Design an enzyme around this catalytic site. Structure first.
Site, PDB file in Angstrom:
ATOM      1  N   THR G  52       0.837  -1.190   0.000  1.00 36.52           N
ATOM      2  CA  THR G  52       0.000   0.000   0.000  1.00 36.52           C
ATOM      3  C   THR G  52       0.875   1.244   0.000  1.00 36.52           C
ATOM      4  OG1 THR G  52      -0.154   0.052   2.417  1.00 36.52           O
ATOM      5  CG2 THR G  52      -1.831  -1.200   1.225  1.00 36.52           C
ATOM      6  N   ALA G  86      -3.791  -3.630  10.576  1.00 41.83           N
ATOM      7  CA  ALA G  86      -5.116  -3.052  10.367  1.00 41.83           C
ATOM      8  C   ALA G  86      -5.920  -3.006  11.661  1.00 41.83           C
ATOM      9  CB  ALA G  86      -5.866  -3.841   9.297  1.00 41.83           C
TER      10      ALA G  86
END
Lengths: 243, 240, 242, 202, 214, 197, 216, 127, 198
Positions: G52, G86
């Site tokens: 990412t 996350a």
């Protein structure tokens, strides 16, 4: 705690204007509530405890009514006053003796046990949450270098060693009789000690005793273990005294 | 005249061997409204009468839910009722989690009594001012239990507590011999007729002042309020 | 007269008395009478159980508990305190069995519970218990035994005891029995007869007799009397009343 | 894996042992407790008296076993005074087992208890490392527990006289000690009349 | 007043410098430096029980004082030996003042054993304890992990093997005082010499205890 | 002493416009040995939600019991049954409560939402979750996800797809069971049936 | 049980089922609890964002953040970005949102960017070395103008006009360093962000006076 | 045997100048094997005595001991001053022995002490 | 620290109840000298328990469970513990002890007969529990489970004598694998009967 009562008479931590505590004196008066008397005499090589035994009912079990206890294998006891308080103090004394033995590696002496009990009992006099126990304890035993020993402690927390003491309703008369006997002479054998201990109570209460109305516990140098005499032996002593 | 010194705490005995604060706390039960609880061979029924502060306020609820097979009814204070209900729910939940079985009503009520006895002996506390009616179902069948502010519980077959419950008790005693054969119908009717004896002779029972709780062999604890009560009220007589 | 010195359990009267304990002992005489008789080979109990209303079940609010597999118990006074003391006795017996692996002797259990009761008459933060109770047991190597404990914390062994409102008449009736040479089957009837004689019907509307023994018949177990024997004893007592 | 096969911590093999050998054998009138000697020592008593008629022998760490014995003597004396009766061997064994099991992860202690009581006669209990409590007719522990077990099991018979039991115990201890050491073997016979100790040397 | 204190402090040992020292020692060893070490004593000691007393010997004082009738010798870490001996001496003096008579050897033995077991053997102090009381002469042997052992003769130190051999060769129960002194001297020399003699004839057990001088 | 043990399993979930499907195998094993051939991994929580978990068995049992207790607590406190999203959020919080000593369990939640449509949520052993249309978990998820990705539908075609996916996956996996259980969540309630494998 | 209740210190000895040094005491309380919240003490596969790339810079008209979801909408007026674990990012940013709402309710005024970043850093600093892993950029607008901060799990907390974290951090950072300008129009800023994120190898947000909006 | 003794990370959902220089990881494990043993010696000793006394005699004895301790430990000085602990030592049995807690780091001469009101509030449980 | 296996415990279900066989041997490690000890417990009139693993933990659990049974039967309200309740309590106790890294090293097999339906459960030290028609834990766990499984698969319904014969032959095969005594317990409508040693 729900507070402290107001007055020179109604609490343990309040001094009187003349400087004296009255709850302790009332605890002393509480000893005579039972109605019995105890006598302890120390001999040349023995110590004897004599006390009354009153069984009022006929449905009672006389085997379970007693006032002579046993702290350790070589220490006797006798209690005067409230029964439940006497039993509670006996349990505390047993615990203290066991703890001393574990911590120091040898048996606790009689004077050390009495001092420990008195030191514990003094704390109840200086705090507002607890109250004194209405009973007095007399211990007997045999020392190594010294012979027999007789000790007594009171609800105020004061203890002392004696030659011949007494407690109960007839304490004053018993003390006078024992004082006369000791001043006359003190060299006594095993037979003489038991005889004079029985005679003191007999002549103070003006009662011709019976074998089932008293209980005796002795400690001797030959056999230093606490032993409670039986009805046959008590009767033999009584017969010898009568003759 | 001589009682003023010995009725201010629960740690003081009166010279006649009585604890006056317990007797005073037992009088808070009669400050509520009437409740009736009865049982049959299969079902257990609770009936309660609701009051309202004014015409613009909802009626206070009296029947609570404890578990899938236990329900209670309240007469007395409110905070104590809430605390006891929380305790009941927690105990049932813990028992079910640990053992994968429902908690027996006898054990539950014994726990209640054991917990309630404590504040009547120690300083700085007051007794619980609430009385309960417990209805449950387990392997032994239906059960009706009664609890008292004095930490006393009884095993009943039909009981009524609250204000002016003597009439209900008299009716239940008179009609005691027919309860064990009735089905759910006529049993709810016996309960309603018993509850109707606590009212003045002029007024009757409507659908906005009655609550019903039923637990049975294969029916879980349910509460019927407002329009759900009409089927039970259809068949009543005109207060003979 | 002890006015002014009777508001706490830690205050001594000028003549050396504690009056809260005396009031607690006075409180026991507000309940019905329970008796217990020790015989040659067992102990049998009997309680006069009053009825409050007909809306209660048969076994509600009993007064005879099962402390252990071999110990019974009968109470008198405030009921909640009786339940608490029964729980304490059960816990003590269980703890002893877990520690040492055999049944607790009766004398030790009596001593433990008596000391626990006595501990409440020392502090101002609690109040003395308001109930008396008796314990009974039997074993092959010891024989029958009976004890009583009162709110002050004093325990004794007995051949026959009675606690409650009418203990004096019950004791007078018991003192006319040669319980040392009889058997439980011959003592159940006497217990029922004494209970019926002592009961007063003017101030008490009705009552139900409650009985239970422990001994050689039950093989060292405390059990409720079978219904037929209860019926026979009740019939004999009613006949003897006439 | 470890789930269905029920694996065990195997306490007895946590460390190698090179100590003495201890044995208790029951005869008709009582029990005979003995221990051998196998650096310095040779004048040390390996038998620890717990009461007037109850003894024990220790295996493992010295300090841990001595502390456990001291605590048990405390508790047993207190209990005997409280109940007003001579103690039972089963009670002493239970008192040992409690601490030997609760502290299994901290101490290296192995205890054997022998004694006599008027209710069940001479008894011998084994409390090895881990907290197990089992009564046995003859109990073996120490270093020769594997070397002499077969011989003792084959030779042992039912209740015999005190002298025969003493001779059998002495023979077993000598065969255990002469594995390839010391020369002092201590024995003690416990009966109703009282303990009777003796030492065999040379 | 400090703004970061909530509860009153207590006493005893402090473990503040544990992790810091743990990493510092590793770093210093990695880079090759030196740090201060702990003083140790390893001189041989011995003792024997003759007819009516105890004879203790040491080589060069090193014989500690616990009571008028009890003496001790130490080997290991000097600071630990000094601290343990002083603490036991003070406790026994308090005990004697309270009880009014001379103490016993078993009491000191029990106190030392319980202390050493409490501190899990991290306090290194091997001791030889001996004395005489009303029961008679006694001699013990204590170890850093808290295990005692009662013997008629003991040896500790670097040269204890020869001394033990001499004792095994020439020991006899109930010997005279001069023979015991000569035996102890010879055993110590086989590995100056200091000797301590505690005899029953120099002690009175029938008089009240009085505080000595130090 | 390892406090973790891996047990086989495989779970699946398909979300529809007015239905939800959750399916799983029925085998318990420890790699080599076979514990049981009958142990479904789908548990019914309420009338409109189903949870399926696989991994270490003891953790699965504890998680299910805790979830049921919390559901009862919420029902008592709020006087209504709690929805699927609330269950998902509560489960995420419960899972993150043990971040430093995690549960070794993989969960999938399926059911209906407030508007009456299918909803599927997938979790991780720490607590991260998101809403999906179809999800596969368990041991054989890696070799099963591409098949579903390369292959909303009606109820019958979705059931046909589920049956073929498990029959293809069982022959190539060492942890699949001998029976397949399917739970169907619709507006009229919940029904389930077992298909032999 | 009234004497034991007075002593306001429940010891295991006073409870039921006690024998020996232990007993049936640790096996008594086995319920599921009533109400609390607390992380467990220290003693599988954990989802982590690896591939990412994120981008964020501030200028005159607000803050623009772009990424490749991967952006957490804390508030209508606050924005956040995740990088790393996350679960940790989601949990701690949910806590931050709750704290911001409490502050607004108490003080009747929205919290500032600096206070929010400090609160997040303080929460994540307590567990240093335990194993947490997160990197966050916090965007917002308050009474002092646009704000931009970077917070991670190592205690770092810095403020700047240009940040970039991800796999293609170097290329995108170089591009937007070459093309940066404080006095920049919104359209040119959009073009610069799009070009940078394209060269890094598409989402796009824009924070204004009155809350953020989505561009594409 | 008295010296051998036998998920609490709350999140505030139930002042940093006052508390500082502390992390959970370092306090997860002790620094020395003797740290917790020495910090909790008296508590362990009391627990051992209570256990043996309860097993041998009954429930009444430990309850009475705890009641006496609580009653006697309520008449002390306020926490910012040093007390003597006379009657507590007499009851506990430590009136004739000296340990390492008495001769090392005298608590009556500590090098740090906080504000009075803060300590009195902390002891009462308010903070 | 070193680990050794435990003794073997077997169990099957038949028409009227369950059959459990256990080994009389002490342990497979250095504790082989503690022979002739029983590992089968009778809990109440409709539950029996067999253990395999550490013996001290088995004795501790035996104490606790017996005390609980006595406590429940003292009240006399007509309620008794079912086999499933014992199974659940054991599972929770094992899991709770495991979570603290101080586990109870055991692997229990529970059988019972309540309400006309037999029960057979399995619990280990990690908290893993399930129910199966036949179970086998111990030294020959993997050499006996498939055999019993296939035998029961051939005939889903088995009689008492057939189940006893199957257990006897399985134990004989296990002994033949590596070279003595065992005992057998049965639960049925009559109660728990234990026969041994053999």
């Amino acid at each position: 705690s729900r507070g402290s009562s107001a007055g020179f008479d109604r609490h343990i931590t309040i001094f009187s204007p003349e400087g004296r505590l009255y709850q302790v004196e009332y605890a002393f008066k509480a000893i005579n509530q039972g109605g019995l008397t105890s006598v302890a005499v120390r001999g040349k090589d023995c110590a004897v405890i004599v006390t009354q035994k009153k069984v009022p009912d006929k449905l009672l079990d006389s085997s379970t009514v007693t006032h002579l206890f046993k702290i350790t294998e070589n220490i006797g006891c006798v209690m005067t006053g409230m029964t439940a308080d006497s039993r509670s103090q006996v349990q505390r004394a047993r615990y203290e003796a066991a703890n001393w033995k574990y911590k120091y590696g040898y048996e606790i002496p009689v004077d050390m046990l009495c001092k420990r009990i008195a030191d514990i009992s003094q704390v109840y006099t200086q705090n507002a949450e607890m109250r004194p126990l209405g009973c007095c304890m007399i211990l007997i035993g045999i020392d190594e270098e010294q012979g027999p020993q007789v000790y007594k402690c009171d609800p105020a927390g004061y203890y002392c060693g004696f030659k011949a003491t007494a407690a109960g309703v007839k304490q004053t008369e018993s003390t006078s009789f024992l004082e006369k006997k000791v001043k006359k002479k003190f060299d006594w054998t095993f037979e003489q000690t038991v005889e004079t201990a029985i005679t003191c109570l007999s002549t103070v209460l003006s009662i011709d005793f019976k074998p089932s109305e008293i209980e005796v516990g002795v400690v001797t140098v030959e056999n230093p273990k606490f032993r409670i005499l039986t009805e046959a032996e008590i009767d033999a002593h009584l017969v010898a005294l009568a003759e | 005249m001589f009682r003023n010194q010995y009725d201010n705490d629960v740690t003081v005995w009166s010279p006649q061997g009585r604890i006056h604060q317990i007797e005073y706390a037992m009088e808070a039960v009669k400050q509520g409204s009437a409740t009736v609880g009865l049982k049959s061979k299969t079902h257990a029924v609770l009936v309660a009468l609701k009051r309202a502060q004014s015409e613009l306020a909802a009626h206070q609820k009296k029947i609570l839910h404890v578990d899938n097979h236990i329900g209670i009814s309240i007469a007395g204070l409110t905070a104590d009722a809430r605390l006891l209900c929380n305790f009941m729910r927690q105990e049932c939940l813990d028992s079910r989690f640990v053992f994968d079985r429902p908690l027996p009503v006898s054990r539950l009520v014994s726990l209640i009594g054991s917990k309630t006895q404590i504040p009547t002996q120690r300083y700085g506390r007051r007794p619980y001012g609430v009385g309960l009616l417990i209805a449950g179902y387990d392997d032994m069948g239906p059960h009706i239990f009664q609890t008292c502010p004095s930490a006393n519980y009884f095993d009943c077959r039909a009981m009524s507590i609250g204000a002016r419950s003597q009439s209900a008790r008299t009716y239940l005693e008179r009609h005691m011999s027919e309860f064990m054969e009735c089905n759910l119908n006529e049993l709810v009717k016996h309960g309603l007729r018993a509850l109707r004896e606590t009212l003045p002779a002029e007024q009757d029972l409507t659908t906005k002042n009655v609550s019903i709780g039923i637990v049975g062999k294969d029916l879980e604890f349910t509460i019927y309020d407002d329009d759900d009560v009409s089927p039970f009220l259809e068949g009543l007589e005109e207060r003979p | 007269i002890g006015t002014g010195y009777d508001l706490s359990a830690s205050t001594f009267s000028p003549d050396g008395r504690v009056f809260q304990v005396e009031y607690a002992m006075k409180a026991v005489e507000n309940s019905s009478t329970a008796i217990g008789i020790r015989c040659k080979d067992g102990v049998v109990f009997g309680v006069e159980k009053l009825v409050l209303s007909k809306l209660y079940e048969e076994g509600s609010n009993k007064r005879l508990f099962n402390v252990d597999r071999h110990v019974g118990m009968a109470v008198a006074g405030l009921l909640a305190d009786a339940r608490s003391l029964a729980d304490i006795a059960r816990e003590e017996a269980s703890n002893f069995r877990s520690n040492f692996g055999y049944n607790i002797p009766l004398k030790h259990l009596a001593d433990r519970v008596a000391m626990y009761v006595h501990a409440y008459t020392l502090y101002s933060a609690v109040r003395p218990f308001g109930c008396s109770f008796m314990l009974g047991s039997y074993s092959v190597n010891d024989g029958a035994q009976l004890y009583m404990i009162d709110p002050s914390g004093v325990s004794y062994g007995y051949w026959g005891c009675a606690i409650g409102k009418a203990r004096q008449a019950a004791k007078t009736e018991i003192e006319k029995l040669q319980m040392k040479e009889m058997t439980c089957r011959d003592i159940v009837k006497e217990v029922a007869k004494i209970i019926y004689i002592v009961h007063d019907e003017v101030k008490d509307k009705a009552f139900e007799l409650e009985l239970s023994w422990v001994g050689e018949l039950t093989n060292g177990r405390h059990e409720i009397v079978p219904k037929d024997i209860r019926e026979e004893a009740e019939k004999y007592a009613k006949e003897s009343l006439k | 894996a470890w789930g269905p096969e029920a694996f065990t911590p195997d306490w007895e093999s946590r460390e190698v042992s090179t100590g003495t050998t201890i044995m208790a054998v029951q005869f008709d009138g009582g029990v005979v407790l003995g221990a051998d000697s196998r650096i310095a020592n040779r004048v040390t008593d390996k038998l620890t008296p717990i009461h007037d008629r109850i003894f024990c022998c220790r295996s493992g760490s010295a300090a841990d076993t001595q502390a456990v014995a001291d605590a048990v003597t405390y508790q047993l004396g207190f209990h005997s005074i409280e109940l007003n009766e001579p103690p039972l061997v089963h009670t002493a064994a239970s008192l040992f087992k409690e601490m030997c099991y609760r502290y299994r992860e901290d101490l290296m202690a192995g205890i054997i208890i022998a004694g006599w009581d008027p209710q069940e006669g001479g008894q011998g209990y084994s409390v090895p490392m881990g907290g197990m409590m089992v009564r046995q007719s003859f109990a073996i522990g120490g270093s020769g527990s594997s070397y002499i077990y077969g011989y003792v099991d084959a030779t042992y018979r039912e209740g015999m006289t005190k002298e025969e039991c003493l001779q059998f115990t002495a023979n077993a201890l000598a065969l255990a000690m002469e594995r390839d050491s010391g020369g002092v073997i201590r024995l003690a016979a416990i009966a109703e009349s009282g303990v009777e100790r003796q030492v065999l040397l040379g | 007043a400090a703004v970061s204190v909530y509860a009153p402090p207590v006493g005893g040992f402090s473990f503040d410098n544990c992790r810091r020292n743990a990493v510092l020692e590793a770093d210093f060893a990695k880079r090759g430096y030196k740090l201060p070490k702990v003083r140790k004593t390893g001189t041989t000691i011995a003792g024997v029980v003759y007819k009516d007393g105890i004879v203790l010997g040491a080589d060069t004082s090193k014989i500690h004082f616990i009571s008028p009738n009890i003496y001790c010798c130490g080997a290991g870490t000097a600071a630990d030996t000094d601290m343990t001996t002083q603490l036991i001496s003070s406790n026994l003096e308090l005990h004697s003042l309270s009880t009014g008579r001379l103490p016993r050897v078993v009491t000191a033995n029990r106190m030392l054993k319980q202390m050493l077991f409490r501190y899990q053997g991290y306090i290194g102090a091997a001791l030889v304890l001996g004395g005489v009381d009303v029961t008679g002469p006694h001699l013990y042997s204590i170890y850093p992990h808290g295990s005692t052992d009662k013997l008629p003769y003991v040896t500790m130190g670097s040269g204890s093997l020869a001394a033990m051999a001499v004792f095994e060769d020439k020991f006899r129960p109930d010997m005279e005082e001069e023979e015991a002194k000569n035996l102890v001297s010879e055993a110590i020399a086989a590995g100056n010499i200091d000797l301590c003699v505690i005899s029953k004839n120099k002690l009175d057990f029938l008089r009240p205890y009085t505080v000595p001088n130090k | 002493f390892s406090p973790y043990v891996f047990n086989g399993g495989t779970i699946l979930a398909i979300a529809g416009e007015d239905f939800a499907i959750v399916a799983s195998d029925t085998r318990l094993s420890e790699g080599f040995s076979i514990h049981t051939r009958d142990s479904p991994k789908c548990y019914k929580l309420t009338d409109k939600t189903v949870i399926g978990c696989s991994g270490f068995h003891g953790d699965c049992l504890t998680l299910t019991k805790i979830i049921e207790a919390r559901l009862k607590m919420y029902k008592h406190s709020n006087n209504k049954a709690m929805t699927t999203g609330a269950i998902a959020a509560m489960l995420s919080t419960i899972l993150y409560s043990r971040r430093f000593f995690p549960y070794y369990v993989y969960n999938i939640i399926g059911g209906l939402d407030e508007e009456g449509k299918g909803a599927v949520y997938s979790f991780d052993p720490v607590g991260s979750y998101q809403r999906d249309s179809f999800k596969a978990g368990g041991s054989a998820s890696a070799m099963l996800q591409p098949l579903l990705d390369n292959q909303p539908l009606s109820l019958d075609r979705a059931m046909r797809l589920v049956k073929d996916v498990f029959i293809s996956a069982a022959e190539r996996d060492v942890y699949t069971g001998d029976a397949l259980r399917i739970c169907i969540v619709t507006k009229e309630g919940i029904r389930e049936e077992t298909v032999s494998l | 049980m009234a004497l034991a209740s007075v002593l306001e210190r429940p010891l295991p000895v006073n409870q039921r089922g006690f024998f020996g040094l232990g007993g049936r005491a640790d096996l008594l309380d086995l319920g599921p609890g009533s109400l609390s919240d607390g992380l467990s003490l220290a003693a599988p596969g954990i989802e982590m964002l690896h591939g990412t790339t994120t981008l964020a810079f501030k200028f005159r008209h607000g803050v623009i953040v772009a990424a490749d979801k991967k952006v957490i909408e804390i508030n209508p007026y606050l924005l956040g970005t995740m990088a790393g674990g996350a679960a940790d990012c989601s949990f701690w940013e949910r806590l931050l949102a709750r704290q911001c709402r409490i502050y607004e309710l108490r003080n009747k005024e929205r919290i500032s960017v600096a206070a929010a970043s400090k609160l997040l850093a303080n929460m994540v600093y307590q567990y240093k070395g335990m194993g947490l892993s997160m990197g966050t950029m916090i965007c917002g607008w308050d009474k002092r103008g646009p704000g931009l901060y970077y917070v991670d799990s190592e205690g770092n907390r810095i403020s700047g006009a240009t940040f970039s974290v991800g796999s293609g951090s170097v290329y995108a950072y170089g591009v937007m360093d070459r093309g940066y300008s404080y006095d920049l129009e919104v359209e040119q800023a959009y073009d610069l962000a799009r070009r940078a994120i394209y060269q890094a190898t598409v989402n796009l947000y824009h924070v204004r006076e009155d809350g953020w909006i989505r561009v594409s | 045997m008295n010296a051998r003794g036998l998920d609490s990370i709350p999140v505030t959902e139930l002042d940093l100048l006052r508390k500082g220089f502390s992390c959970v990881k370092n306090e997860l494990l002790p620094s020395h094997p003797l740290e917790l043993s020495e910090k909790n010696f008296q508590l362990n000793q009391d627990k051992m005595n209570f256990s043996t006394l309860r097993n041998i005699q009954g429930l009444f004895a430990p309850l009475k001991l705890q009641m006496e301790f609580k009653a006697v430990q309520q008449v002390q000085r306020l926490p910012f001053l040093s007390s003597s602990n006379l009657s507590l030592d007499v009851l506990r049995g430590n009136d004739e022995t000296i340990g390492f807690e008495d001769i090392l780091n005298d608590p009556s001469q500590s090098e740090v002490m906080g504000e009075p009101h803060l300590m009195v509030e902390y002891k009462l449980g308010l903070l | 620290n070193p680990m050794v296996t435990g003794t073997s415990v077997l169990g099957v279900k038949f028409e009227g109840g369950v059959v459990i066989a256990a080994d009389m041997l002490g342990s497979y490690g250095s504790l082989a000298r503690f022979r002739n000890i029983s590992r089968i417990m009778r809990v109440n009139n409709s539950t029996m328990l067999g253990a395999s693993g550490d013996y001290a933990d088995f004795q501790y659990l035996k104490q606790v469970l017996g005390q609980m049974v006595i406590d429940e039967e003292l009240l006399g309200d007509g309620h008794s513990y079912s086999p499933r309740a014992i199974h659940s309590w054991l599972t929770r106790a094992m899991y709770s002890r495991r979570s603290k890294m101080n586990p109870l090293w055991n692997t229990m097999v529970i059988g019972g007969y309540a309400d006309g339906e037999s029960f057979l459960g399995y619990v280990d030290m990690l908290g893993v529990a399930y129910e199966a028609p036949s179970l086998a834990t111990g030294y020959g766990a993997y050499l006996a489970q498939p055999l019993l499984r296939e035998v029961l698969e051939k005939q889903p319904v088995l009689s008492q004598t057939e189940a006893r014969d199957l257990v006897e032959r399985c134990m004989r095969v296990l002994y033949y694998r590596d070279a003595n005594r065992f005992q057998t317990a049965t639960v049925t409508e009559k109660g728990v009967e234990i026969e041994g040693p053999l």
